[PDB]
Symmetry: C3
Subunit: 123 residues, 3 copies
């Protein structure tokens, strides 16, 4: 009986309808995945922005603090001139040891974060 050609065509049609619904599920999930990835990108940018602003202000203040401390060291050595300066009065294996100024290096890091986030606006 050609009733076979009816039924096997039916199963094929049935199976196509399953395939299309599974493609439907996949498609909607891809739209969901793309959305979440953009939301994640957005959070990375916003977070990097806040963090680098915090870094900027810590760094500006650190350097101003350092200037004043180095000035204070000069003036305290002056007042301790006859005692051999702080180097002799307060004496430590790292007493005279100079104070690093990493403000430009930290600035350079801030610039590198800013440069990375510029790249989001193309990716």
């Amino acid at each position: 009986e050609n009733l076979y050609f009816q039924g096997n065509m039916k199963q094929i049609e049935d199976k196509i309808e399953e395939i299309l619904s599974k493609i439907y599920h996949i498609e909607n999930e891809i739209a969901r995945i793309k959305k979440l990835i953009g939301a994640i990108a957005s959070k990375i940018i916003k977070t990097a922005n806040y963090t680098t602003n915090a870094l900027f202000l810590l760094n500006k203040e650190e350097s101003e603090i350092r200037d004043h401390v180095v000035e204070h060291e000069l003036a305290l050595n002056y007042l301790l001139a006859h005692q051999g300066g702080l180097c002799n009065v307060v004496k430590g294996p790292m007493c005279s040891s100079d104070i690093d100024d990493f403000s430009k290096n930290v600035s350079d890091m801030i610039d590198k974060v800013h440069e990375e986030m510029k790249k989001f606006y193309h990716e």
Copy 2:
């Protein structure tokens, strides 16, 4: 003649439906691994933001305390050097008298904002 022409084409259709089904299987597997991989990235963002903001909080608090003491020191040094025109006149420079910015509340504000962004990962 025709009985086999129906058959072979029905076989070609069926077998192509098996290719599609397996192709779908592999797509589903990649989709699952993608969602997992996104999940782990989100996780690392939160943990790294958490660690970084903790460091910022501590640098900030200490920087403020240090500032407080440098302020006292300048005062004491201005007092001690008073009969020489204060600190200002003795250890000169175009920026000797310069006030020291206090950015502690502005940094704290930046910490707040990161914490707020991370809160939002718990809603998606």
Copy 3:
């Protein structure tokens, strides 16, 4: 009749060319999603590295400044001893207050970021 079976067979095959097309569209999209994800991972790593390099420097210099400020307090207390020390001459509820040293605590947070990022090289 023949024309019916054949005409439906055509409709099947037409759906198949439509399915295979949508699938290839999906596959191309999955590959643009994978590339996007890896670019994002790399931005996270670079960004974290620059930020922690900035934290490391700020921390190092903050710790040096602190050692110097502490010395200076001893020096100013020695100088103003014939007048009650710093606790009397500027007199505040946080004048003699000990300055916290969080350099190990900050180094710990830097370690923790480096460990989180080392993990990207496994996924």
